[PDB]
């Protein structure tokens, strides 16, 4: 965006928001969290027993499922549990950190309906260097100045700690929490194991097995290329199961993309081919195709998890420095104003920092406004209704031709 370039350029301004960017993205990136969120949706819908699996990949009741397939269930459950944890414990924090940026920015610069805190600080400095002002009024202005800065320092520290807490939550998402949460790293390990096993046993049984499973892998590769290529999301984030269980959820908006429409047609073709195929081909390609895509997904969850850790360590440092600079403002700078009887330079710095804060506050608001909202295993992952809309409204599950 134009605004992202403005934010870097501004990132040098004292009392301002600093470099709240991440490459060509806002430091809280709409596109990043939208993409991640797609993988999580897929996770939230994973099946954990035979009947669920059949319903999910859309396999005829008349088809037998070999026993080694059962390994799927435990790891799918863990993956699902992970997704649910993320949905409850991680993603809402991201929304909150965006809100913290909007809140601070509108507080110091003022809400567009307005005086923000920086204008109030400026006027206080006016009173401190006014010669008409008697000594009592000076002393009072100084106390008010320090108090108001103290509130900004407290909030900045709160936001700093919130960013630290996001980093901690990410480390738990990836490495587990030493309790009932298995980490993405271990989930990835087991998913790769099961993938190897099932591929050896049921993924190379015939030429058509290899052909079709390779076709699905190619579609996932292209889909992923397209996803990583599209930088700018213009719509409120929603998700779609249009591509079905072979590929997983995608951000709804990306359905417009020509390449993705091509992929939808190739998927419709696969469905036609499988639904009337020899039973073992039908079964193996649905189940293992989906599993291969889940492995690609979990790889993406891992790497983008590590990336996000780096981003929120950066944000953490930004709030630390914001608080440090306001502490300097209320002590050393304020004393200099008193000694020099000159406040104009500080006042103009506060004006300029106000404008920079407006820029990042608008980006934070935009993020929030457009973000997505919404061995037994039968008790750890009970059946829920999560996929039912998708089973009732996605083409993959249309069986009129059966």
mmCIF file of N, CA, C and O in Angstrom, residues 272-350:
data_model
loop_
_atom_site.group_PDB
_atom_site.id
_atom_site.type_symbol
_atom_site.label_atom_id
_atom_site.label_comp_id
_atom_site.label_asym_id
_atom_site.label_seq_id
_atom_site.Cartn_x
_atom_site.Cartn_y
_atom_site.Cartn_z
ATOM 1 N N UNK A 272 -15.342 -36.493 -10.759
ATOM 2 C CA UNK A 272 -16.007 -37.343 -11.756
ATOM 3 C C UNK A 272 -15.256 -38.657 -11.947
ATOM 4 O O UNK A 272 -15.854 -39.733 -11.960
ATOM 5 N N UNK A 273 -13.940 -38.569 -12.073
ATOM 6 C CA UNK A 273 -13.122 -39.753 -12.272
ATOM 7 C C UNK A 273 -13.176 -40.735 -11.090
ATOM 8 O O UNK A 273 -13.293 -41.943 -11.284
ATOM 9 N N UNK A 274 -13.093 -40.216 -9.871
ATOM 10 C CA UNK A 274 -13.046 -41.053 -8.670
ATOM 11 C C UNK A 274 -14.396 -41.671 -8.329
ATOM 12 O O UNK A 274 -14.464 -42.827 -7.922
ATOM 13 N N UNK A 275 -15.469 -40.911 -8.496
ATOM 14 C CA UNK A 275 -16.770 -41.373 -8.041
ATOM 15 C C UNK A 275 -17.243 -42.644 -8.775
ATOM 16 O O UNK A 275 -18.056 -43.396 -8.246
ATOM 17 N N UNK A 276 -16.728 -42.888 -9.976
ATOM 18 C CA UNK A 276 -17.072 -44.106 -10.716
ATOM 19 C C UNK A 276 -15.861 -45.031 -10.892
ATOM 20 O O UNK A 276 -15.889 -45.959 -11.702
ATOM 21 N N UNK A 277 -14.806 -44.787 -10.119
ATOM 22 C CA UNK A 277 -13.579 -45.558 -10.238
ATOM 23 C C UNK A 277 -13.647 -46.900 -9.506
ATOM 24 O O UNK A 277 -14.552 -47.144 -8.711
ATOM 25 N N UNK A 278 -12.682 -47.765 -9.792
ATOM 26 C CA UNK A 278 -12.503 -48.983 -9.019
ATOM 27 C C UNK A 278 -12.348 -48.606 -7.545
ATOM 28 O O UNK A 278 -11.596 -47.684 -7.230
ATOM 29 N N UNK A 279 -13.047 -49.321 -6.661
ATOM 30 C CA UNK A 279 -13.186 -48.940 -5.246
ATOM 31 C C UNK A 279 -11.891 -48.577 -4.525
ATOM 32 O O UNK A 279 -11.836 -47.554 -3.835
ATOM 33 N N UNK A 280 -10.855 -49.392 -4.661
ATOM 34 C CA UNK A 280 -9.620 -49.092 -3.952
ATOM 35 C C UNK A 280 -8.988 -47.775 -4.443
ATOM 36 O O UNK A 280 -8.436 -47.027 -3.642
ATOM 37 N N UNK A 281 -9.076 -47.489 -5.739
ATOM 38 C CA UNK A 281 -8.573 -46.216 -6.275
ATOM 39 C C UNK A 281 -9.361 -45.024 -5.718
ATOM 40 O O UNK A 281 -8.779 -44.029 -5.280
ATOM 41 N N UNK A 282 -10.682 -45.139 -5.778
ATOM 42 C CA UNK A 282 -11.611 -44.178 -5.212
ATOM 43 C C UNK A 282 -11.188 -43.807 -3.773
ATOM 44 O O UNK A 282 -10.833 -42.644 -3.451
ATOM 45 N N UNK A 283 -11.173 -44.837 -2.935
ATOM 46 C CA UNK A 283 -10.862 -44.693 -1.520
ATOM 47 C C UNK A 283 -9.467 -44.128 -1.260
ATOM 48 O O UNK A 283 -9.294 -43.155 -0.501
ATOM 49 N N UNK A 284 -8.469 -44.748 -1.876
ATOM 50 C CA UNK A 284 -7.093 -44.394 -1.590
ATOM 51 C C UNK A 284 -6.775 -42.969 -2.050
ATOM 52 O O UNK A 284 -6.051 -42.236 -1.378
ATOM 53 N N UNK A 285 -7.301 -42.576 -3.202
ATOM 54 C CA UNK A 285 -6.983 -41.248 -3.691
ATOM 55 C C UNK A 285 -7.699 -40.192 -2.831
ATOM 56 O O UNK A 285 -7.081 -39.200 -2.458
ATOM 57 N N UNK A 286 -8.970 -40.400 -2.488
ATOM 58 C CA UNK A 286 -9.619 -39.437 -1.585
ATOM 59 C C UNK A 286 -8.868 -39.295 -0.236
ATOM 60 O O UNK A 286 -8.465 -38.174 0.184
ATOM 61 N N UNK A 287 -8.603 -40.427 0.407
ATOM 62 C CA UNK A 287 -8.012 -40.390 1.740
ATOM 63 C C UNK A 287 -6.569 -39.896 1.737
ATOM 64 O O UNK A 287 -6.174 -39.040 2.543
ATOM 65 N N UNK A 288 -5.770 -40.420 0.822
ATOM 66 C CA UNK A 288 -4.363 -40.084 0.861
ATOM 67 C C UNK A 288 -4.113 -38.721 0.200
ATOM 68 O O UNK A 288 -3.225 -37.994 0.613
ATOM 69 N N UNK A 289 -4.916 -38.365 -0.796
ATOM 70 C CA UNK A 289 -4.823 -37.041 -1.394
ATOM 71 C C UNK A 289 -5.028 -35.994 -0.306
ATOM 72 O O UNK A 289 -4.177 -35.106 -0.100
ATOM 73 N N UNK A 290 -6.146 -36.131 0.409
ATOM 74 C CA UNK A 290 -6.404 -35.241 1.533
ATOM 75 C C UNK A 290 -5.229 -35.226 2.523
ATOM 76 O O UNK A 290 -4.735 -34.150 2.880
ATOM 77 N N UNK A 291 -4.755 -36.402 2.944
ATOM 78 C CA UNK A 291 -3.612 -36.456 3.878
ATOM 79 C C UNK A 291 -2.357 -35.713 3.391
ATOM 80 O O UNK A 291 -1.661 -35.050 4.179
ATOM 81 N N UNK A 292 -2.049 -35.839 2.101
ATOM 82 C CA UNK A 292 -0.908 -35.136 1.536
ATOM 83 C C UNK A 292 -1.115 -33.616 1.669
ATOM 84 O O UNK A 292 -0.187 -32.878 2.028
ATOM 85 N N UNK A 293 -2.332 -33.165 1.382
ATOM 86 C CA UNK A 293 -2.607 -31.734 1.519
ATOM 87 C C UNK A 293 -2.514 -31.271 2.972
ATOM 88 O O UNK A 293 -1.972 -30.206 3.247
ATOM 89 N N UNK A 294 -3.006 -32.081 3.905
ATOM 90 C CA UNK A 294 -2.870 -31.770 5.326
ATOM 91 C C UNK A 294 -1.397 -31.651 5.724
ATOM 92 O O UNK A 294 -1.030 -30.802 6.535
ATOM 93 N N UNK A 295 -0.545 -32.500 5.155
ATOM 94 C CA UNK A 295 0.876 -32.373 5.442
ATOM 95 C C UNK A 295 1.465 -31.059 4.889
ATOM 96 O O UNK A 295 2.269 -30.386 5.558
ATOM 97 N N UNK A 296 1.061 -30.683 3.678
ATOM 98 C CA UNK A 296 1.469 -29.369 3.181
ATOM 99 C C UNK A 296 0.989 -28.244 4.130
ATOM 100 O O UNK A 296 1.755 -27.330 4.457
ATOM 101 N N UNK A 297 -0.267 -28.337 4.573
ATOM 102 C CA UNK A 297 -0.855 -27.361 5.490
ATOM 103 C C UNK A 297 -0.007 -27.232 6.741
ATOM 104 O O UNK A 297 0.356 -26.126 7.128
ATOM 105 N N UNK A 298 0.304 -28.357 7.381
ATOM 106 C CA UNK A 298 0.986 -28.297 8.675
ATOM 107 C C UNK A 298 2.396 -27.740 8.500
ATOM 108 O O UNK A 298 2.915 -27.061 9.406
ATOM 109 N N UNK A 299 3.005 -28.002 7.341
ATOM 110 C CA UNK A 299 4.287 -27.368 7.037
ATOM 111 C C UNK A 299 4.126 -25.843 7.020
ATOM 112 O O UNK A 299 4.971 -25.104 7.542
ATOM 113 N N UNK A 300 3.045 -25.379 6.400
ATOM 114 C CA UNK A 300 2.803 -23.931 6.356
ATOM 115 C C UNK A 300 2.508 -23.328 7.732
ATOM 116 O O UNK A 300 2.945 -22.215 8.045
ATOM 117 N N UNK A 301 1.761 -24.063 8.547
ATOM 118 C CA UNK A 301 1.479 -23.629 9.906
ATOM 119 C C UNK A 301 2.781 -23.499 10.684
ATOM 120 O O UNK A 301 2.969 -22.542 11.440
ATOM 121 N N UNK A 302 3.694 -24.447 10.505
ATOM 122 C CA UNK A 302 4.970 -24.360 11.208
ATOM 123 C C UNK A 302 5.770 -23.121 10.772
ATOM 124 O O UNK A 302 6.165 -22.284 11.615
ATOM 125 N N UNK A 303 6.018 -22.994 9.468
ATOM 126 C CA UNK A 303 6.937 -21.929 9.047
ATOM 127 C C UNK A 303 6.332 -20.543 9.334
ATOM 128 O O UNK A 303 7.019 -19.640 9.843
ATOM 129 N N UNK A 304 5.041 -20.385 9.060
ATOM 130 C CA UNK A 304 4.412 -19.091 9.277
ATOM 131 C C UNK A 304 4.254 -18.812 10.785
ATOM 132 O O UNK A 304 4.269 -17.650 11.223
ATOM 133 N N UNK A 305 4.196 -19.868 11.597
ATOM 134 C CA UNK A 305 4.287 -19.699 13.037
ATOM 135 C C UNK A 305 5.607 -19.069 13.477
ATOM 136 O O UNK A 305 5.636 -18.115 14.296
ATOM 137 N N UNK A 306 6.710 -19.588 12.936
ATOM 138 C CA UNK A 306 8.028 -19.022 13.261
ATOM 139 C C UNK A 306 8.152 -17.558 12.790
ATOM 140 O O UNK A 306 8.639 -16.664 13.539
ATOM 141 N N UNK A 307 7.692 -17.311 11.564
ATOM 142 C CA UNK A 307 7.645 -15.942 11.035
ATOM 143 C C UNK A 307 6.902 -14.983 11.979
ATOM 144 O O UNK A 307 7.386 -13.885 12.298
ATOM 145 N N UNK A 308 5.722 -15.410 12.418
ATOM 146 C CA UNK A 308 4.888 -14.594 13.286
ATOM 147 C C UNK A 308 5.595 -14.310 14.601
ATOM 148 O O UNK A 308 5.466 -13.211 15.157
ATOM 149 N N UNK A 309 6.353 -15.285 15.101
ATOM 150 C CA UNK A 309 7.147 -15.028 16.302
ATOM 151 C C UNK A 309 8.086 -13.839 16.095
ATOM 152 O O UNK A 309 8.174 -12.937 16.953
ATOM 153 N N UNK A 310 8.779 -13.835 14.955
ATOM 154 C CA UNK A 310 9.681 -12.706 14.664
ATOM 155 C C UNK A 310 8.944 -11.359 14.568
ATOM 156 O O UNK A 310 9.418 -10.329 15.085
ATOM 157 N N UNK A 311 7.785 -11.374 13.918
ATOM 158 C CA UNK A 311 6.970 -10.159 13.803
ATOM 159 C C UNK A 311 6.567 -9.616 15.176
ATOM 160 O O UNK A 311 6.677 -8.412 15.455
ATOM 161 N N UNK A 312 6.116 -10.488 16.068
ATOM 162 C CA UNK A 312 5.613 -9.951 17.321
ATOM 163 C C UNK A 312 6.706 -9.653 18.341
ATOM 164 O O UNK A 312 6.494 -8.873 19.281
ATOM 165 N N UNK A 313 7.890 -10.209 18.128
ATOM 166 C CA UNK A 313 9.059 -9.733 18.862
ATOM 167 C C UNK A 313 9.413 -8.301 18.423
ATOM 168 O O UNK A 313 9.750 -7.440 19.258
ATOM 169 N N UNK A 314 9.332 -8.056 17.117
ATOM 170 C CA UNK A 314 9.491 -6.691 16.606
ATOM 171 C C UNK A 314 8.462 -5.723 17.224
ATOM 172 O O UNK A 314 8.817 -4.636 17.707
ATOM 173 N N UNK A 315 7.194 -6.127 17.241
ATOM 174 C CA UNK A 315 6.142 -5.269 17.791
ATOM 175 C C UNK A 315 6.380 -5.003 19.272
ATOM 176 O O UNK A 315 6.234 -3.869 19.752
ATOM 177 N N UNK A 316 6.779 -6.051 19.987
ATOM 178 C CA UNK A 316 7.136 -5.935 21.387
ATOM 179 C C UNK A 316 8.206 -4.850 21.604
ATOM 180 O O UNK A 316 8.047 -3.963 22.458
ATOM 181 N N UNK A 317 9.281 -4.922 20.818
ATOM 182 C CA UNK A 317 10.329 -3.910 20.892
ATOM 183 C C UNK A 317 9.838 -2.498 20.589
ATOM 184 O O UNK A 317 10.289 -1.514 21.187
ATOM 185 N N UNK A 318 8.908 -2.400 19.644
ATOM 186 C CA UNK A 318 8.322 -1.106 19.298
ATOM 187 C C UNK A 318 7.582 -0.509 20.502
ATOM 188 O O UNK A 318 7.842 0.643 20.865
ATOM 189 N N UNK A 319 6.726 -1.285 21.169
ATOM 190 C CA UNK A 319 6.063 -0.749 22.380
ATOM 191 C C UNK A 319 7.032 -0.400 23.526
ATOM 192 O O UNK A 319 6.823 0.590 24.272
ATOM 193 N N UNK A 320 8.085 -1.208 23.674
ATOM 194 C CA UNK A 320 9.110 -0.883 24.657
ATOM 195 C C UNK A 320 9.687 0.516 24.399
ATOM 196 O O UNK A 320 9.762 1.351 25.307
ATOM 197 N N UNK A 321 10.076 0.771 23.153
ATOM 198 C CA UNK A 321 10.679 2.065 22.825
ATOM 199 C C UNK A 321 9.682 3.221 22.929
ATOM 200 O O UNK A 321 10.047 4.310 23.363
ATOM 201 N N UNK A 322 8.428 2.984 22.533
ATOM 202 C CA UNK A 322 7.398 4.012 22.668
ATOM 203 C C UNK A 322 7.295 4.460 24.151
ATOM 204 O O UNK A 322 7.335 5.683 24.472
ATOM 205 N N UNK A 323 7.212 3.481 25.054
ATOM 206 C CA UNK A 323 7.161 3.812 26.472
ATOM 207 C C UNK A 323 8.409 4.536 26.980
ATOM 208 O O UNK A 323 8.313 5.491 27.784
ATOM 209 N N UNK A 324 9.581 4.073 26.540
ATOM 210 C CA UNK A 324 10.848 4.715 26.913
ATOM 211 C C UNK A 324 10.907 6.187 26.483
ATOM 212 O O UNK A 324 11.358 7.065 27.233
ATOM 213 N N UNK A 325 10.420 6.467 25.281
ATOM 214 C CA UNK A 325 10.487 7.824 24.762
ATOM 215 C C UNK A 325 9.512 8.741 25.497
ATOM 216 O O UNK A 325 9.843 9.907 25.755
ATOM 217 N N UNK A 326 8.339 8.227 25.868
ATOM 218 C CA UNK A 326 7.428 9.062 26.637
ATOM 219 C C UNK A 326 7.998 9.303 28.066
ATOM 220 O O UNK A 326 7.876 10.402 28.612
ATOM 221 N N UNK A 327 8.658 8.301 28.648
ATOM 222 C CA UNK A 327 9.340 8.557 29.932
ATOM 223 C C UNK A 327 10.404 9.657 29.800
ATOM 224 O O UNK A 327 10.545 10.511 30.683
ATOM 225 N N UNK A 328 11.144 9.648 28.701
ATOM 226 C CA UNK A 328 12.120 10.717 28.457
ATOM 227 C C UNK A 328 11.456 12.081 28.272
ATOM 228 O O UNK A 328 11.979 13.092 28.734
ATOM 229 N N UNK A 329 10.311 12.091 27.587
ATOM 230 C CA UNK A 329 9.537 13.306 27.358
ATOM 231 C C UNK A 329 9.129 13.967 28.682
ATOM 232 O O UNK A 329 9.264 15.183 28.838
ATOM 233 N N UNK A 330 8.632 13.159 29.622
ATOM 234 C CA UNK A 330 8.090 13.700 30.880
ATOM 235 C C UNK A 330 9.189 14.041 31.904
ATOM 236 O O UNK A 330 8.914 14.661 32.939
ATOM 237 N N UNK A 331 10.425 13.627 31.635
ATOM 238 C CA UNK A 331 11.514 13.942 32.553
ATOM 239 C C UNK A 331 12.495 14.924 31.912
ATOM 240 O O UNK A 331 12.325 16.138 32.018
ATOM 241 N N UNK A 332 13.493 14.387 31.226
ATOM 242 C CA UNK A 332 14.547 15.177 30.605
ATOM 243 C C UNK A 332 14.046 16.271 29.663
ATOM 244 O O UNK A 332 14.445 17.429 29.805
ATOM 245 N N UNK A 333 13.164 15.929 28.722
ATOM 246 C CA UNK A 333 12.706 16.929 27.753
ATOM 247 C C UNK A 333 11.946 18.022 28.456
ATOM 248 O O UNK A 333 12.147 19.203 28.174
ATOM 249 N N UNK A 334 11.072 17.632 29.379
ATOM 250 C CA UNK A 334 10.255 18.596 30.109
ATOM 251 C C UNK A 334 11.148 19.545 30.940
ATOM 252 O O UNK A 334 10.941 20.772 30.982
ATOM 253 N N UNK A 335 12.164 18.980 31.575
ATOM 254 C CA UNK A 335 13.118 19.809 32.312
ATOM 255 C C UNK A 335 13.830 20.797 31.382
ATOM 256 O O UNK A 335 14.015 21.953 31.753
ATOM 257 N N UNK A 336 14.228 20.343 30.189
ATOM 258 C CA UNK A 336 14.874 21.226 29.203
ATOM 259 C C UNK A 336 13.960 22.366 28.799
ATOM 260 O O UNK A 336 14.413 23.490 28.597
ATOM 261 N N UNK A 337 12.674 22.066 28.637
ATOM 262 C CA UNK A 337 11.708 23.106 28.292
ATOM 263 C C UNK A 337 11.663 24.149 29.392
ATOM 264 O O UNK A 337 11.629 25.356 29.131
ATOM 265 N N UNK A 338 11.674 23.681 30.634
ATOM 266 C CA UNK A 338 11.693 24.611 31.756
ATOM 267 C C UNK A 338 12.958 25.466 31.798
ATOM 268 O O UNK A 338 12.883 26.672 32.028
ATOM 269 N N UNK A 339 14.112 24.845 31.586
ATOM 270 C CA UNK A 339 15.377 25.568 31.665
ATOM 271 C C UNK A 339 15.516 26.564 30.525
ATOM 272 O O UNK A 339 16.061 27.644 30.708
ATOM 273 N N UNK A 340 15.013 26.194 29.350
ATOM 274 C CA UNK A 340 15.199 26.992 28.142
ATOM 275 C C UNK A 340 14.062 27.977 27.900
ATOM 276 O O UNK A 340 14.208 28.917 27.129
ATOM 277 N N UNK A 341 12.940 27.754 28.569
ATOM 278 C CA UNK A 341 11.694 28.457 28.293
ATOM 279 C C UNK A 341 11.278 28.356 26.825
ATOM 280 O O UNK A 341 10.675 29.272 26.275
ATOM 281 N N UNK A 342 11.599 27.241 26.193
ATOM 282 C CA UNK A 342 11.262 27.066 24.789
ATOM 283 C C UNK A 342 10.663 25.693 24.554
ATOM 284 O O UNK A 342 11.319 24.680 24.801
ATOM 285 N N UNK A 343 9.423 25.655 24.075
ATOM 286 C CA UNK A 343 8.737 24.378 23.873
ATOM 287 C C UNK A 343 8.394 24.065 22.405
ATOM 288 O O UNK A 343 7.862 22.996 22.120
ATOM 289 N N UNK A 344 8.706 24.979 21.489
ATOM 290 C CA UNK A 344 8.179 24.909 20.123
ATOM 291 C C UNK A 344 8.612 23.661 19.370
ATOM 292 O O UNK A 344 7.821 23.055 18.638
ATOM 293 N N UNK A 345 9.871 23.286 19.537
ATOM 294 C CA UNK A 345 10.398 22.121 18.852
ATOM 295 C C UNK A 345 9.722 20.836 19.334
ATOM 296 O O UNK A 345 9.333 20.006 18.529
ATOM 297 N N UNK A 346 9.581 20.683 20.646
ATOM 298 C CA UNK A 346 8.860 19.535 21.207
ATOM 299 C C UNK A 346 7.420 19.504 20.724
ATOM 300 O O UNK A 346 6.884 18.453 20.392
ATOM 301 N N UNK A 347 6.782 20.666 20.714
ATOM 302 C CA UNK A 347 5.401 20.750 20.268
ATOM 303 C C UNK A 347 5.258 20.289 18.820
ATOM 304 O O UNK A 347 4.310 19.575 18.475
ATOM 305 N N UNK A 348 6.193 20.695 17.972
ATOM 306 C CA UNK A 348 6.104 20.317 16.554
ATOM 307 C C UNK A 348 6.388 18.811 16.386
ATOM 308 O O UNK A 348 5.750 18.137 15.559
ATOM 309 N N UNK A 349 7.330 18.286 17.172
ATOM 310 C CA UNK A 349 7.549 16.830 17.224
ATOM 311 C C UNK A 349 6.275 16.061 17.622
ATOM 312 O O UNK A 349 5.961 15.025 17.057
ATOM 313 N N UNK A 350 5.556 16.572 18.618
ATOM 314 C CA UNK A 350 4.306 15.939 19.040
ATOM 315 C C UNK A 350 3.253 16.025 17.929
ATOM 316 O O UNK A 350 2.533 15.058 17.684
#
